[PDB]
Design a protein around this ligand. Structure first.
Ligand SMILES: Nc1nc(NC2CC2)cc(-c2cccc(Cl)c2Cl)n1
Length: 153
C-alpha cells in the first residue's frame, strides 16, 4: 500500500524556486511544491493542481525527472513521490500559508533546512539525470538506508 504524491521544482539556469511549509507535515523545511494526488486525477494533473494551489503558478509543461519511494520503519504505508521540473511558469509566485516562496541561487540551495533525502537526489536534477529512489526513514530526520537508480540524460 502506498499513497501518491507530487513534487514540482521550478528550475531555471541560475536559480530554483522553493517553498517553506508553514504548518503540517514538513513544516519549517524548504521544498518544492506538491502534495497528495487525489482519487480520479492523474499524477501530472495533481502536480499542476498543487503548484497552482500552493504558489498561484500555472505552467505550460511539466517534465518528469524522478520517482522516490519513502518507507517509515514500523508504518505499513509507503509514500510514492513523483518529481517534476519546469521552467515554463506563468505568473509570479503568490505567498500562500501552506508555503512561503523564495528563489535560491543554485550554489545556495538550503540543504540543511530541507528534508534530508534532498541532499542525495536534488543534485541529480543539476547533473542531467533521471532517477528512481528509495529511502528508509526512522522518524522524520534519520535516513537508515537508501537506493538510487540513475540514468544520464
Ligand atoms: N523533498 C521531500 N522529501 C521528502 N522526504 C520524505 C521523508 C518525508 C518528502 C517530500 C514530500 C513531497 C511531496 C509531498 C510531501 Cl507531503 C512531502 Cl513530505 N519531499
Amino acid at each position: 500500500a502506498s499513497r501518491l504524491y507530487t513534487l514540482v521544482l521550478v528550475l531555471q539556469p541560475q536559480r530554483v524556486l522553493l517553498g517553506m511549509k508553514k504548518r503540517g507535515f514538513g513544516a519549517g523545511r524548504w521544498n518544492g511544491f506538491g502534495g497528495k494526488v487525489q482519487e480520479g486525477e492523474t499524477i501530472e494533473d495533481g502536480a499542476r493542481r498543487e503548484l497552482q494551489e500552493e504558489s498561484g503558478l500555472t505552467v505550460d509543461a511539466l517534465h518528469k525527472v524522478g520517482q522516490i519511494v519513502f518507507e517509515f520503519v514500523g508504518e505499513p504505508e509507503l509514500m510514492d513521490v513523483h518529481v517534476f521540473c519546469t521552467d515554463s511558469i506563468q505568473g509570479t509566485p503568490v505567498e500562500s500559508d501552506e508555503m512561503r516562496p523564495c528563489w535560491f541561487q543554485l550554489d545556495q540551495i538550503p540543504f540543511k533546512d530541507m528534508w534530508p533525502d534532498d541532499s542525495y537526489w536534488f543534485p541529480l536534477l543539476l547533473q542531467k539525470k533521471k532517477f528512481h529512489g528509495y529511502f528508509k526513514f526512522q522518524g522524520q530526520d534519520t535516513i537508515l538506508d537508501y537506493t538510487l537508480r540513475e540514468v544520464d540524460t
